[PDB]
Amino acid sequence: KKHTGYVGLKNQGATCYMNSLLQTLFFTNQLRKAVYMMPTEGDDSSKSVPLALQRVFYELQHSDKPVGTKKLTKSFGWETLDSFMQHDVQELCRVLLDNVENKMKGTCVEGTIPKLFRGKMVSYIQCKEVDYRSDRREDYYDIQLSIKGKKNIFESFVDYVAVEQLDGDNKYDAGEHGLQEAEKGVKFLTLPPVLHLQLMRFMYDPQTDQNIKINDRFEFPEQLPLDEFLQKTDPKDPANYILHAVLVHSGDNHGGHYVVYLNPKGDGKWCKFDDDVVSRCTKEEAIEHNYGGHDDDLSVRHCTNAYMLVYIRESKLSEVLQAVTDHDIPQQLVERLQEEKRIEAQK
């Protein structure tokens, strides 16, 4: 009837934020396969988030009509009214991947999430007046990028790795040297196969206790080279990334709507996923149009823009976005699910 090949997700009330994330993770093929692999045989279908994700993924992959997510929200232990509260999509991502990661611990797919999304950074501190240096390596699953005053993703990363002065009110604690003035600089040691970028589109205004969303123009490319920001680069694997998904937030955080644009196969063929409606779109509708900064405009167009970006490493693309067939789904799973399409029938 329509031609996208993909199905949407029904909105339960205010779950657009959840639907955008789910499409985003469903099309992270390698992760979907890992989830299908989780041991859900002896799980209570009403308390199991892993069974709920498997179910949502299976439907998205086989159904020909919008998919529901009530069993998913039920496995979170939520009551119906909880589906009517708006939420931040990056927040859902942090909490969900952590939950699924822990549930994967002890299983054959244990460690899958860190493998796909976790990277490492190095923080360098140095005292200006005392000869003392100290490093700190830290993992990350996404990068919050500074937007204000930044024209694009490059100026943003340049800003992320920029050395800062640990001055006056924030002087560095050396130890036996006490509070000293120092410089702090951050570099990346590794960038993951799948890169999640959170655009810092906020600022807190003291005269309202409110977060006023930053709708300024901020450009991000289809192709994103990041070798410049690695402490040490690798010739056989440059940190060249390809845009996969654009999570778009519309409105002020006084009410908004989430939608996600993806090119599932990483082939530049984009589609827009707005809850139950999946439609083919142009590259510009997914990219440029979500740069933001359309002011003096008295419309929603000004407050509609990219919040979260998903890039996939060029060298990992064919693996991360590997085709998933029924061959990849466990008989035990398929059967349990089809026995449900039954049990919900004769009743």
Binding site: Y140, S146, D169, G256, Y307
Partner: protein, 76 residues
């Protein structure tokens, strides 16, 4: 011990804390310096959003660790 927090303005500030401090405590110390209500704060470290109730030692947050402060863009 001293830890760091990258604020909304993209600047790194210091916080004096103890391993047993709760995330609620930390959010509190941030309100003092940045003036942001704790209920609006989201602290991200090692890919995890720090849970109120838990403490710094629960997340193995040591001296010089850097936390990442973000707000929210709620949508439905």
């Amino acid at each position: 011990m001293q830890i760091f927090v990258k604020t909304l303005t993209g600047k790194t500030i210091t916080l004096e804390v103890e391993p047993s401090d709760t995330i609620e405590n930390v959010k509190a110390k941030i309100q003092d310096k940045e003036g942001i209500p704790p209920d609006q704060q989201r602290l991200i470290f090692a890919g995890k959003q720090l849970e109120d109730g838990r403490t710094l030692s629960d997340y193995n947050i040591q001296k010089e660790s850097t936390l990442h402060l973000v707000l929210r863009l709620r949508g439905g």
